[PDB]
Design an enzyme around this catalytic site. Structure first.
Site, PDB file in Angstrom:
ATOM      1  N   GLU A   1       1.785  -1.095  -5.247  1.00  0.00           N
ATOM      2  CA  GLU A   1       0.895  -0.074  -5.771  1.00  0.00           C
ATOM      3  C   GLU A   1       1.714   1.030  -6.385  1.00  0.00           C
ATOM      4  OE1 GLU A   1      -1.393   2.119  -2.900  1.00  0.00           O
ATOM      5  OE2 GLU A   1      -2.750   2.751  -4.463  1.00  0.00           O
TER       6      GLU A   1
ATOM      7  N   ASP B   1     -10.147   1.831  -5.860  1.00  0.00           N
ATOM      8  CA  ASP B   1      -9.780   3.208  -5.937  1.00  0.00           C
ATOM      9  C   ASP B   1     -10.118   3.781  -7.309  1.00  0.00           C
ATOM     10  OD1 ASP B   1      -8.427   3.054  -3.347  1.00  0.00           O
ATOM     11  OD2 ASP B   1      -6.690   2.083  -4.351  1.00  0.00           O
TER      12      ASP B   1
ATOM     13  N   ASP C   1       0.808  -1.198   0.000  1.00  0.00           N
ATOM     14  CA  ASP C   1       0.000   0.000   0.000  1.00  0.00           C
ATOM     15  C   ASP C   1       0.887   1.317   0.000  1.00  0.00           C
ATOM     16  OD1 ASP C   1      -2.572   1.240   0.175  1.00  0.00           O
ATOM     17  OD2 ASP C   1      -1.935   1.967   2.055  1.00  0.00           O
TER      18      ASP C   1
HETATM   19  O1  LIG Z   1      -2.892   9.210  -0.453  1.00  0.00           O
HETATM   20  C1  LIG Z   1      -3.915   8.253  -0.199  1.00  0.00           C
HETATM   21  C2  LIG Z   1      -5.151   9.045   0.224  1.00  0.00           C
HETATM   22  O2  LIG Z   1      -5.152   9.342   1.642  1.00  0.00           O
HETATM   23  C3  LIG Z   1      -6.379   9.946   2.159  1.00  0.00           C
HETATM   24  O3  LIG Z   1      -7.534   9.108   1.918  1.00  0.00           O
HETATM   25  C4  LIG Z   1      -7.715   8.008   2.831  1.00  0.00           C
HETATM   26  C5  LIG Z   1      -8.144   6.788   1.994  1.00  0.00           C
HETATM   27  O4  LIG Z   1      -7.738   5.609   2.699  1.00  0.00           O
HETATM   28  C6  LIG Z   1      -7.847   4.406   1.877  1.00  0.00           C
HETATM   29  O5  LIG Z   1      -7.136   4.498   0.662  1.00  0.00           O
HETATM   30  C7  LIG Z   1      -6.094   3.571   0.355  1.00  0.00           C
HETATM   31  C8  LIG Z   1      -6.415   3.017  -1.020  1.00  0.00           C
HETATM   32  O6  LIG Z   1      -7.655   2.307  -1.039  1.00  0.00           O
HETATM   33  C9  LIG Z   1      -5.201   2.158  -1.385  1.00  0.00           C
HETATM   34  O7  LIG Z   1      -5.433   1.185  -2.411  1.00  0.00           O
HETATM   35  C10 LIG Z   1      -3.984   3.081  -1.621  1.00  0.00           C
HETATM   36  O8  LIG Z   1      -4.135   4.078  -2.655  1.00  0.00           O
HETATM   37  O9  LIG Z   1      -3.700   3.689  -0.365  1.00  0.00           O
HETATM   38  C11 LIG Z   1      -4.792   4.345   0.313  1.00  0.00           C
HETATM   39  C12 LIG Z   1      -4.385   4.685   1.721  1.00  0.00           C
HETATM   40  O10 LIG Z   1      -4.020   3.571   2.504  1.00  0.00           O
HETATM   41  C13 LIG Z   1      -9.344   4.194   1.639  1.00  0.00           C
HETATM   42  O11 LIG Z   1      -9.521   2.992   0.882  1.00  0.00           O
HETATM   43  C14 LIG Z   1     -10.009   5.395   0.960  1.00  0.00           C
HETATM   44  O12 LIG Z   1     -11.453   5.199   0.953  1.00  0.00           O
HETATM   45  C15 LIG Z   1      -9.633   6.702   1.690  1.00  0.00           C
HETATM   46  O13 LIG Z   1     -10.050   7.839   0.931  1.00  0.00           O
HETATM   47  C16 LIG Z   1      -6.661  11.270   1.472  1.00  0.00           C
HETATM   48  O14 LIG Z   1      -7.889  11.909   1.924  1.00  0.00           O
HETATM   49  C17 LIG Z   1      -6.641  11.047  -0.048  1.00  0.00           C
HETATM   50  O15 LIG Z   1      -6.749  12.270  -0.762  1.00  0.00           O
HETATM   51  C18 LIG Z   1      -5.334  10.381  -0.491  1.00  0.00           C
HETATM   52  O16 LIG Z   1      -5.270  10.206  -1.906  1.00  0.00           O
HETATM   53  O1  LIG Z   2      -4.580   5.106  -2.966  1.00  0.00           O
HETATM   54  C1  LIG Z   2      -5.697   6.085  -3.037  1.00  0.00           C
HETATM   55  C2  LIG Z   2      -5.683   7.156  -4.148  1.00  0.00           C
HETATM   56  O2  LIG Z   2      -5.351   6.544  -5.398  1.00  0.00           O
HETATM   57  C3  LIG Z   2      -5.151   7.434  -6.478  1.00  0.00           C
HETATM   58  O3  LIG Z   2      -4.100   8.317  -6.207  1.00  0.00           O
HETATM   59  C4  LIG Z   2      -2.819   7.637  -6.225  1.00  0.00           C
HETATM   60  C5  LIG Z   2      -1.709   8.361  -5.486  1.00  0.00           C
HETATM   61  O4  LIG Z   2      -1.393   9.463  -6.344  1.00  0.00           O
HETATM   62  C6  LIG Z   2      -0.344  10.278  -5.802  1.00  0.00           C
HETATM   63  O5  LIG Z   2       0.829   9.492  -5.523  1.00  0.00           O
HETATM   64  C7  LIG Z   2       1.983   9.639  -6.316  1.00  0.00           C
HETATM   65  C8  LIG Z   2       3.088  10.252  -5.457  1.00  0.00           C
HETATM   66  O6  LIG Z   2       2.762  11.570  -5.045  1.00  0.00           O
HETATM   67  C9  LIG Z   2       4.428  10.302  -6.202  1.00  0.00           C
HETATM   68  O7  LIG Z   2       5.455  10.703  -5.249  1.00  0.00           O
HETATM   69  C10 LIG Z   2       4.629   8.847  -6.688  1.00  0.00           C
HETATM   70  O8  LIG Z   2       5.859   8.840  -7.349  1.00  0.00           O
HETATM   71  O9  LIG Z   2       3.559   8.402  -7.613  1.00  0.00           O
HETATM   72  C11 LIG Z   2       2.398   8.237  -6.788  1.00  0.00           C
HETATM   73  C12 LIG Z   2       1.345   7.334  -7.460  1.00  0.00           C
HETATM   74  O10 LIG Z   2       1.941   6.084  -7.883  1.00  0.00           O
HETATM   75  C13 LIG Z   2      -0.750  10.879  -4.459  1.00  0.00           C
HETATM   76  O11 LIG Z   2       0.377  11.652  -4.016  1.00  0.00           O
HETATM   77  C14 LIG Z   2      -1.131   9.781  -3.444  1.00  0.00           C
HETATM   78  O12 LIG Z   2      -1.794  10.379  -2.336  1.00  0.00           O
HETATM   79  C15 LIG Z   2      -2.047   8.694  -4.006  1.00  0.00           C
HETATM   80  O13 LIG Z   2      -1.950   7.455  -3.210  1.00  0.00           O
HETATM   81  C16 LIG Z   2      -6.324   8.325  -6.742  1.00  0.00           C
HETATM   82  O14 LIG Z   2      -5.931   9.234  -7.755  1.00  0.00           O
HETATM   83  C17 LIG Z   2      -6.696   9.072  -5.483  1.00  0.00           C
HETATM   84  O15 LIG Z   2      -7.805   9.924  -5.771  1.00  0.00           O
HETATM   85  C18 LIG Z   2      -6.930   8.060  -4.362  1.00  0.00           C
HETATM   86  O16 LIG Z   2      -7.269   8.911  -3.254  1.00  0.00           O
END
Ligand SMILES: OC[C@H]1O[C@H](OC[C@H]2O[C@H](O[C@H]3[C@H](O)[C@@H](O)[C@@H](O)O[C@@H]3CO)[C@H](O)[C@@H](O)[C@@H]2O)[C@H](O)[C@@H](O)[C@@H]1O
Ligand SMILES: OC[C@H]1O[C@H](OC[C@H]2O[C@H](O[C@H]3[C@H](O)[C@@H](O)[C@H](O)O[C@@H]3CO)[C@H](O)[C@@H](O)[C@@H]2O)[C@H](O)[C@@H](O)[C@@H]1O
Ligand SMILES: OC[C@H]1O[C@H](OC[C@H]2O[C@H](O[C@H]3[C@H](O)[C@@H](O)[C@@H](O)O[C@@H]3CO)[C@H](O)[C@@H](O)[C@@H]2O)[C@H](O)[C@@H](O)[C@@H]1O
Ligand SMILES: OC[C@H]1O[C@H](OC[C@H]2O[C@H](O[C@H]3[C@H](O)[C@@H](O)[C@H](O)O[C@@H]3CO)[C@H](O)[C@@H](O)[C@@H]2O)[C@H](O)[C@@H](O)[C@@H]1O
Ligand SMILES: [Ca+2]
Lengths: 450, 442
Positions: free
Chosen positions: A230, A297, A201
């Site tokens: 991821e 996501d 993750d």
């Molecule tokens: O940068 C990640 C995200 O962090 C906050 O949102 C919390 C989310 O937590 C979970 O998201 C996970 C994804 O499902 C994973 O597959 C992967 O991308 O990592 C994240 C974090 O462990 C949860 O499933 C979501 O429903 C939540 O929104 C911020 O608020 C977001 O803007 C960020 O993108």
């Molecule tokens: O996991 C939940 C999230 O998934 C998507 O966003 C992905 C990811 O995008 C950005 O991450 C980038 C990093 O900032 C860079 O440093 C890295 O090199 O590349 C990653 C992606 O591989 C965000 O910074 C990060 O918060 C997020 O996990 C969806 O687009 C997003 O809306 C979801 O919330």
């Protein structure tokens, strides 16, 4: 070292376990909603591990032989990224025994299990974090986190490091050897409980030194344990032989959907993008790529295709044609719809009158073709644009070849002669109907070893 | 022998009251709106100018021949009750419009076969009305079989008819005068430019007459096509002295048994098609007019209970067969309807009311056929692969083609097992649920 060999034969099924199947409603919380309910960031449906066990037939009949589970450890949310105890199955999913039972039933069926490793952060309910809130600078766990100072606050903005500013996801201090030790024990503990790998993750929020240490700890237990990162952008940094065996291939997702749903990219641009992606992936990691069209996501595939099931099928033909392990997101195979999170986390209906079974059968066919043809699993990949609306994905092993031809127009013909990579096929012309696909392979015969 | 050009033909059947109404000045006073339910009595105002105006549709389907239901002056919407065989029906247009339709068809390479209704005419026909009026003193009394006078329909007609129907008096084909009139009809429309005749209820007349008819038509030109309506075995019509082929209602029944009803499996479909093939004499395979539906049957899509993919299986089989395939107006866009009158609905010209993927599927099958020469002149062999899977192999001089049709939930075909195909093909080919595959090999 490279991706484990078995990845080449894998086909994954991604399950968000709150929403798959509710077999044991004694595990349901007090305010469980009806199973058909609209998913929200706060509601619980009662999906459990016994429900997974009970529906393994569906998964095997789909053609999948590997599961990717989103987080299953004790947590406070429906998505369970806010873990509170990494050594316990969440109480609403079941017990360690049930988990054991799933792993055994999976082994019996030749199904592998990959869990979600949420190592960058835990939940604010975690014991370590709760101990820091209460005991502050006197907590033994103060430096397992990055707390600016006391008292700990979230009331304006958090005064501690988090996942992307989220208060309930405090960031683990991976610079602390005690945290790294905990983290590696989690890795090792679930491997001892029978898992076959880990999906990382937000690994880009930690650092590569830590991921090198993780690899050594995992691969030291067995070299066939899969690690998949991821990564939404270029995978290349994860594939240097020292961290992952591949990534979630969101690059191929965007390319495929650009062509089949959006209409933004033609077959030339799709072919170019997939060949360039392929060339950037080091030798030994192509098979370890985890190919997908959607996830927990993203919006659901059929919603991305605005309900056009036949167009959706073109994305699935492409998915199953690519080198790397294809993964279906639970319920996409029966035509669930949904916008992006929480919309895509709807509960899986088990009443088959609500399924699009022609969609299901379409996907099964693609899977069966792939399972039957060695070249579709272990062949090199070349993508070939035939015209703006038509692409061939050719998979070649020695003199053997398989071809999946994908057409998004109103019908066409493909002259297999005068396209050199298609040459060993005996068919000289192949027709494609509107939004049609054709799948062909050279005569193959298992070779005798004595 | 059937004329050679039948091998490259693909027919489009039009029921002209219902295709297109281009000229409102020809509409009757009782004309109903174009969206109405078809009935035994209603007129929608379709005309010949409507045909001319949509010829581009017909070409774009991949058709190059039209079969028109009757167009001569008549009192019904189906026009089998002709009142003057030497005039276009006034609601359809004039002899000049007809000439124009022939010329616009020729320009686009479209042939025209007309419906020959020689067993009977309408009660409005001048000869029959002369008999009702002048009785025994009418010059035309023996052009019919009238039992006695006065002529009455009232309980039951007191004259011979088509199957008891009072407004379809039976022509007396035993009268040389009647045969002369009939032959003059045949000749006249050939002199106006037509390419052939479809024979209505030919089994109600006699073969002697039909041999005279062939001699008269082929004497104008050997390439004029004669096709019999026949719902059972075609073989009586194929001895070289009557028709060039029949409407292939046998293959209609076999195909739909497999794709729609589920009563016959691939093995039975194959065997039935190979037997039919064996019963049709050499020189007449090409002359068979293959169809899945007509103005006398329910619509293909209704037979399929609205299952468009199942329907597409029917068309795949249709277009694979030796003999000329025929699409029934509006089936290509997925019109529905029960049998007559329900299969005689108005053709929609709003493209948003068409099932355009159905249209495109059919166009694809047509194009494949038009492109591959073996699909027009190749020997036909059917082979069942599975209870649900059939291959129709067509074998040319320098090339072989197969159309594989699967009605199950998906399968794999080893092309080395279709031995008709297998001396230059060992590919495996995948078929999806209700999938087809079309391939050719030099
Ligand atoms: O940068 C990640 C995200 O962090 C906050 O949102 C919390 C989310 O937590 C979970 O998201 C996970 C994804 O499902 C994973 O597959 C992967 O991308 O990592 C994240 C974090 O462990 C949860 O499933 C979501 O429903 C939540 O929104 C911020 O608020 C977001 O803007 C960020 O993108
Ligand atoms: O996991 C939940 C999230 O998934 C998507 O966003 C992905 C990811 O995008 C950005 O991450 C980038 C990093 O900032 C860079 O440093 C890295 O090199 O590349 C990653 C992606 O591989 C965000 O910074 C990060 O918060 C997020 O996990 C969806 O687009 C997003 O809306 C979801 O919330
Ligand atoms: O014997 C045939 C039929 O005759 C009567 O019905 C009158 C029908 O006349 C027309 O039907 C014609 C078909 O459409 C042709 O393609 C071919 O089969 O020949 C017939 C007669 O010329 C008209 O189109 C129909 O709407 C009428 O029902 C009897 O009442 C029927 O029972 C007989 O089967
Ligand atoms: O024509 C409209 C009509 O079409 C179908 O019926 C066709 C046809 O069937 C029978 O004719 C048979 C003769 O009786 C036999 O002597 C001959 O060998 O074979 C023909 C069939 O080829 C009826 O006798 C005849 O009246 C009819 O035209 C539909 O079944 C029917 O419901 C329609 O009205
Ligand atoms: Ca008109």
């Amino acid at each position: 070292v490279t991706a484990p060999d078995w990845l080449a034969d894998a086909v994954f099924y991604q399950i968000f376990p709150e929403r798959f199947a509710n077999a044991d409603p004694s595990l349901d919380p007090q305010n469980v909603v009806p199973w058909g309910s609209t998913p929200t960031p706060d509601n619980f449906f009662g999906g459990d591990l016994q429900g997974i066990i009970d529906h393994l037939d569906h998964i095997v009949a789909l053609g999948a032989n590997a599961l990717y589970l989103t987080p299953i450890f004790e947590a406070d949310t429906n998505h369970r990224y806010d873990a509170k105890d990494y050594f316990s199955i969440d109480h609403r999913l079941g017990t360690l025994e049930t988990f054991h039972a799933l792993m055994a039933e999976c082994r019996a069926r030749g199904i592998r299990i990959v869990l979600d490793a949420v190592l960058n952060h835990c939940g604010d309910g975690h014991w370590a974090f709760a101990d820091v809130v209460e005991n502050e600078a006197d907590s033994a766990y103060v430096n397992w986190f990055s707390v600016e100072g006391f008292p700990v606050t979230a009331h304006p903005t958090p005064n501690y490091r988090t996942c992307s500013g989220c208060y309930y996801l405090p960031k683990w201090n991976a610079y602390n050897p005690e945290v790294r030790h905990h983290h590696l024990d989690v890795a090792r503990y679930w491997i001892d409980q029978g898992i076959d790998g880990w999906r990382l993750d937000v690994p880009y929020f930690i650092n590569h030194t830590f991921w090198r240490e993780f690899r050594t700890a995992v691969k030291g237990k067995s070299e066939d344990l899969y690690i998949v990162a991821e990564e939404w952008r270029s995978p290349v940094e994860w594939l240097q032989g020292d961290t992952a065996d591949g990534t979630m291939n969101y690059t191929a997702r965007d390319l495929i959907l650009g062509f089949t749903a959006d209409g933004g990219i033609d077959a030339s641009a799709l072919a170019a993008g997939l060949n360039a992606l392929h060339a950037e992936i080091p030798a030994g990691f192509h098979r370890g790529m985890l190919n997908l069209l959607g996830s927990h996501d993203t919006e659901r595939v059929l919603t991305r295709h605005a309900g056009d099931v036949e167009a959706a099928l073109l994305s699935y033909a492409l998915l199953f044609s690519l080198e790397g392990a294809p993964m279906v997101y639970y319920g996409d195979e029966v035509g669930l719809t949904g916008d992006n999170d929480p919309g895509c986390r709807g509960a899986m209906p088990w009443n088959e009158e609500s399924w699009n079974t022609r969609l299901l059968d379409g996907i099964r066919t693609f899977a069966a073709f792939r399972a039957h043809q060695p070249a579709m699993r272990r062949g090199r990949q070349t993508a070939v644009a035939l015209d703006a609306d038509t692409i061939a994905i050719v998979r070649s092993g020695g003199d053997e070849r398989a071809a999946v031809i994908v057409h998004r127009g109103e019908g066409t013909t493909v002259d297999t002669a005068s396209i050199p990579e298609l040459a060993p096929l005996d068919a000289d012309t192949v027709v494609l109907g509107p939004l049609g696909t054709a799948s062909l392979a050279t005569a193959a015969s298992p070779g005798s070893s004595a």
